[PDB]
Design a protein around this motif. Structure first.
Motif, PDB file in Angstrom:
ATOM      1  N   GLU A 102      12.056   4.062   0.987  1.00 11.35           N
ATOM      2  CA  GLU A 102      13.070   5.037   0.613  1.00 11.35           C
ATOM      3  C   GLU A 102      13.679   4.678  -0.735  1.00 11.35           C
ATOM      4  OE1 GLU A 102      16.433   6.322   0.135  1.00 11.35           O
ATOM      5  OE2 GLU A 102      15.125   8.108  -0.237  1.00 11.35           O
ATOM      6  N   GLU A 103      13.911   3.387  -0.976  1.00 13.20           N
ATOM      7  CA  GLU A 103      14.541   2.946  -2.208  1.00 13.20           C
ATOM      8  C   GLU A 103      13.728   3.406  -3.405  1.00 13.20           C
ATOM      9  OE1 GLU A 103      15.417  -1.211  -2.363  1.00 13.20           O
ATOM     10  OE2 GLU A 103      16.246  -1.038  -4.414  1.00 13.20           O
ATOM     11  N   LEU A 104      12.395   3.218  -3.335  1.00 14.29           N
ATOM     12  CA  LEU A 104      11.549   3.582  -4.465  1.00 14.29           C
ATOM     13  C   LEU A 104      11.589   5.093  -4.680  1.00 14.29           C
ATOM     14  CD1 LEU A 104       9.624   2.884  -6.698  1.00 14.29           C
ATOM     15  CD2 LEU A 104       7.766   3.019  -5.083  1.00 14.29           C
ATOM     16  N   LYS A 105      11.551   5.865  -3.584  1.00 14.68           N
ATOM     17  CA  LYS A 105      11.628   7.320  -3.751  1.00 14.68           C
ATOM     18  C   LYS A 105      12.951   7.710  -4.387  1.00 14.68           C
ATOM     19  CE  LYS A 105       8.517   8.489  -0.004  1.00 14.68           C
ATOM     20  NZ  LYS A 105       8.196   9.298   1.230  1.00 14.68           N
ATOM     21  N   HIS A 106      14.038   7.097  -3.923  1.00 10.60           N
ATOM     22  CA  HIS A 106      15.335   7.368  -4.528  1.00 10.60           C
ATOM     23  C   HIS A 106      15.283   7.147  -6.029  1.00 10.60           C
ATOM     24  CE1 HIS A 106      19.794   7.214  -5.018  1.00 10.60           C
ATOM     25  NE2 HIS A 106      19.583   8.308  -4.314  1.00 10.60           N
ATOM     26  N   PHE A 107      14.687   6.020  -6.449  1.00 10.95           N
ATOM     27  CA  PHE A 107      14.627   5.690  -7.858  1.00 10.95           C
ATOM     28  C   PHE A 107      13.868   6.763  -8.612  1.00 10.95           C
ATOM     29  CE2 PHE A 107      14.565   2.683 -11.332  1.00 10.95           C
ATOM     30  CZ  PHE A 107      13.444   3.076 -12.041  1.00 10.95           C
ATOM     31  N   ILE A 108      12.667   7.090  -8.141  1.00 16.06           N
ATOM     32  CA  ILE A 108      11.923   8.111  -8.830  1.00 16.06           C
ATOM     33  C   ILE A 108      12.752   9.393  -8.885  1.00 16.06           C
ATOM     34  CG2 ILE A 108       9.922   9.537  -8.700  1.00 16.06           C
ATOM     35  CD1 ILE A 108       8.425   7.112  -7.378  1.00 16.06           C
ATOM     36  N   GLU A 160       0.820  -1.203   0.000  1.00 13.17           N
ATOM     37  CA  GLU A 160       0.000   0.000   0.000  1.00 13.17           C
ATOM     38  C   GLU A 160       0.861   1.263   0.000  1.00 13.17           C
ATOM     39  OE1 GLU A 160      -2.847  -0.624  -1.001  1.00 13.17           O
ATOM     40  OE2 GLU A 160      -2.776  -2.775  -0.510  1.00 13.17           O
ATOM     41  N   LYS A 161       1.912   1.312   0.820  1.00 14.18           N
ATOM     42  CA  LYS A 161       2.713   2.526   0.796  1.00 14.18           C
ATOM     43  C   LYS A 161       3.261   2.762  -0.606  1.00 14.18           C
ATOM     44  CE  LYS A 161       4.752   1.234   5.202  1.00 14.18           C
ATOM     45  NZ  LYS A 161       5.716   0.130   4.831  1.00 14.18           N
ATOM     46  N   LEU A 162       3.652   1.694  -1.279  1.00 15.62           N
ATOM     47  CA  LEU A 162       4.270   1.854  -2.586  1.00 15.62           C
ATOM     48  C   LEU A 162       3.237   2.225  -3.647  1.00 15.62           C
ATOM     49  CD1 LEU A 162       7.007  -0.945  -2.640  1.00 15.62           C
ATOM     50  CD2 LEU A 162       7.169   1.371  -1.859  1.00 15.62           C
ATOM     51  N   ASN A 163       2.029   1.678  -3.574  1.00 15.28           N
ATOM     52  CA  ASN A 163       1.023   2.138  -4.518  1.00 15.28           C
ATOM     53  C   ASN A 163       0.736   3.603  -4.307  1.00 15.28           C
ATOM     54  OD1 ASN A 163       0.852  -0.251  -5.748  1.00 15.28           O
ATOM     55  ND2 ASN A 163      -1.080  -0.890  -4.749  1.00 15.28           N
ATOM     56  N   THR A 164       0.719   4.023  -3.047  1.00 15.08           N
ATOM     57  CA  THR A 164       0.492   5.425  -2.751  1.00 15.08           C
ATOM     58  C   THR A 164       1.539   6.277  -3.418  1.00 15.08           C
ATOM     59  OG1 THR A 164      -0.675   5.066  -0.664  1.00 15.08           O
ATOM     60  CG2 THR A 164       0.477   7.132  -0.959  1.00 15.08           C
ATOM     61  N   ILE A 165       2.808   5.876  -3.284  1.00 13.53           N
ATOM     62  CA  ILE A 165       3.909   6.615  -3.881  1.00 13.53           C
ATOM     63  C   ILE A 165       3.711   6.708  -5.385  1.00 13.53           C
ATOM     64  CG2 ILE A 165       6.420   6.596  -4.345  1.00 13.53           C
ATOM     65  CD1 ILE A 165       5.487   7.200  -1.481  1.00 13.53           C
ATOM     66  N   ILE A 166       3.455   5.551  -6.009  1.00 17.07           N
ATOM     67  CA  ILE A 166       3.295   5.506  -7.456  1.00 17.07           C
ATOM     68  C   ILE A 166       2.225   6.507  -7.885  1.00 17.07           C
ATOM     69  CG2 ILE A 166       2.326   4.179  -9.310  1.00 17.07           C
ATOM     70  CD1 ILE A 166       3.840   1.728  -8.151  1.00 17.07           C
ATOM     71  N   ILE A 167       1.069   6.463  -7.236  1.00 11.57           N
ATOM     72  CA  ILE A 167       0.003   7.369  -7.627  1.00 11.57           C
ATOM     73  C   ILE A 167       0.456   8.826  -7.487  1.00 11.57           C
ATOM     74  CG2 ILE A 167      -2.107   8.314  -6.845  1.00 11.57           C
ATOM     75  CD1 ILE A 167      -2.570   4.896  -6.377  1.00 11.57           C
ATOM     76  N   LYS A 168       1.099   9.158  -6.368  1.00  7.58           N
ATOM     77  CA  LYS A 168       1.524  10.539  -6.197  1.00  7.58           C
ATOM     78  C   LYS A 168       2.449  10.971  -7.325  1.00  7.58           C
ATOM     79  CE  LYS A 168       3.858  14.231  -4.719  1.00  7.58           C
ATOM     80  NZ  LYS A 168       2.948  15.059  -5.562  1.00  7.58           N
ATOM     81  N   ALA A 169       3.205  10.014  -7.858  1.00  8.01           N
ATOM     82  CA  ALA A 169       4.252  10.227  -8.874  1.00  8.01           C
ATOM     83  C   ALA A 169       3.660  10.599 -10.220  1.00  8.01           C
ATOM     84  CB  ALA A 169       5.096   9.004  -8.982  1.00  8.01           C
ATOM     85  N   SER A 170       2.371  10.401 -10.436  1.00  5.26           N
ATOM     86  CA  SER A 170       1.705  10.824 -11.685  1.00  5.26           C
ATOM     87  C   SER A 170       0.660  11.878 -11.358  1.00  5.26           C
ATOM     88  CB  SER A 170       1.111   9.677 -12.388  1.00  5.26           C
ATOM     89  OG  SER A 170       1.942   8.545 -12.232  1.00  5.26           O
ATOM     90  N   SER A 197       6.551   5.328 -16.512  1.00  8.10           N
ATOM     91  CA  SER A 197       5.595   4.564 -15.737  1.00  8.10           C
ATOM     92  C   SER A 197       6.026   3.113 -15.669  1.00  8.10           C
ATOM     93  CB  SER A 197       4.197   4.696 -16.322  1.00  8.10           C
ATOM     94  OG  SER A 197       4.029   3.877 -17.458  1.00  8.10           O
ATOM     95  N   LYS A 198       6.507   2.571 -16.786  1.00  9.90           N
ATOM     96  CA  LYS A 198       6.946   1.184 -16.762  1.00  9.90           C
ATOM     97  C   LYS A 198       8.143   0.990 -15.835  1.00  9.90           C
ATOM     98  CE  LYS A 198       5.670   0.530 -21.522  1.00  9.90           C
ATOM     99  NZ  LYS A 198       6.297   0.411 -22.884  1.00  9.90           N
ATOM    100  N   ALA A 199       9.115   1.906 -15.871  1.00  6.73           N
ATOM    101  CA  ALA A 199      10.289   1.808 -14.997  1.00  6.73           C
ATOM    102  C   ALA A 199       9.893   1.812 -13.522  1.00  6.73           C
ATOM    103  CB  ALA A 199      11.253   2.967 -15.280  1.00  6.73           C
ATOM    104  N   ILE A 200       8.991   2.738 -13.137  1.00 11.40           N
ATOM    105  CA  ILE A 200       8.538   2.795 -11.747  1.00 11.40           C
ATOM    106  C   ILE A 200       7.809   1.514 -11.390  1.00 11.40           C
ATOM    107  CG2 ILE A 200       7.056   4.050 -10.111  1.00 11.40           C
ATOM    108  CD1 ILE A 200       7.609   6.593 -11.806  1.00 11.40           C
ATOM    109  N   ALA A 201       6.936   1.048 -12.268  1.00 11.30           N
ATOM    110  CA  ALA A 201       6.163  -0.164 -11.973  1.00 11.30           C
ATOM    111  C   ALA A 201       7.069  -1.375 -11.785  1.00 11.30           C
ATOM    112  CB  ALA A 201       5.160  -0.444 -13.108  1.00 11.30           C
ATOM    113  N   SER A 202       8.066  -1.546 -12.662  1.00 11.93           N
ATOM    114  CA  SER A 202       8.974  -2.671 -12.546  1.00 11.93           C
ATOM    115  C   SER A 202       9.840  -2.546 -11.308  1.00 11.93           C
ATOM    116  CB  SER A 202       9.859  -2.790 -13.776  1.00 11.93           C
ATOM    117  OG  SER A 202       9.114  -3.308 -14.829  1.00 11.93           O
TER     118      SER A 202
END
Lengths: 63, 72, 74
Positions: free
Chosen positions: C61-67, A53-63, C5-10
């Motif tokens: 944190e890792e995912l934020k770093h990537f973005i 859930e935290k990561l889906n939240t991040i993803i959504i915020k990212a777009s 979007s694909k990079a973030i998703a993967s």
């Protein structure tokens, strides 16, 4: 604070010596070469779900 | 003789598996202790029993490979 | 969909696989520890939760770093 490492290495040594006793006894064969272990570079689903859930939240915020 | 190769191969395999069990148990236990230092001594008993018993099963696994192989 | 979007998703999928692996490994080891010395059940569980939480946060944190890296150099 090396107690855990010392413990694990000690277990591995005892094990590999017992392996050698078996190999020698019956019968012959040669020297193993697996390196000694090293330590450096109930329900868990709740943590998986929490992360998801935290990561889906991040993803959504990212777009 | 000819068989020497095969036994050595399975022994290397088993040692690799046990070595991994060891590295994992120790990594987890070190992190547990990192969070709760009063565990450092008391957890050793449970670590040691686990690694000793796993060790024996590995050892046993090799013996029953020998015995099975030498059946003919 | 976009390259980005694909990079973030993967990247997200990879982090989740790694995290799932770590949780299952921690849980397996702790279950064997407790079977052998059950008087430890409560403190080991506690330390477990601590670890799985901190690692959880590092994943975040890792995912934020990537973005952030991606959006500053592509």
């Amino acid at each position: 604070s090396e107690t855990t490492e010392r413990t694990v290495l000690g277990e591995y040594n005892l094990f590999s010596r017992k392996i050698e006793e078996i190999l020698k006894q019956k019968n012959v064969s040669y020297v193993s070469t697996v390196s000694t272990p090293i330590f450096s570079t109930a329900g868990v689903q709740e943590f998986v779900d929490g992360l998801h859930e935290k990561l889906n939240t991040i993803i959504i915020k990212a777009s | 003789t000819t068989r020497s190769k095969a036994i050595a191969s399975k022994t290397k395999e088993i040692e690799q598996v046990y070595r991994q069990d060891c590295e994992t148990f120790g990594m987890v236990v070190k992190m547990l202790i990192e969070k709760d230092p009063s565990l450092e001594k008391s957890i050793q008993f449970a670590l040691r029993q686990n690694l000793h018993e796993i060790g024996e099963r590995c050892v046993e696994e090799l013996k029953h490979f020998i015995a099975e192989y030498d059946t003919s």
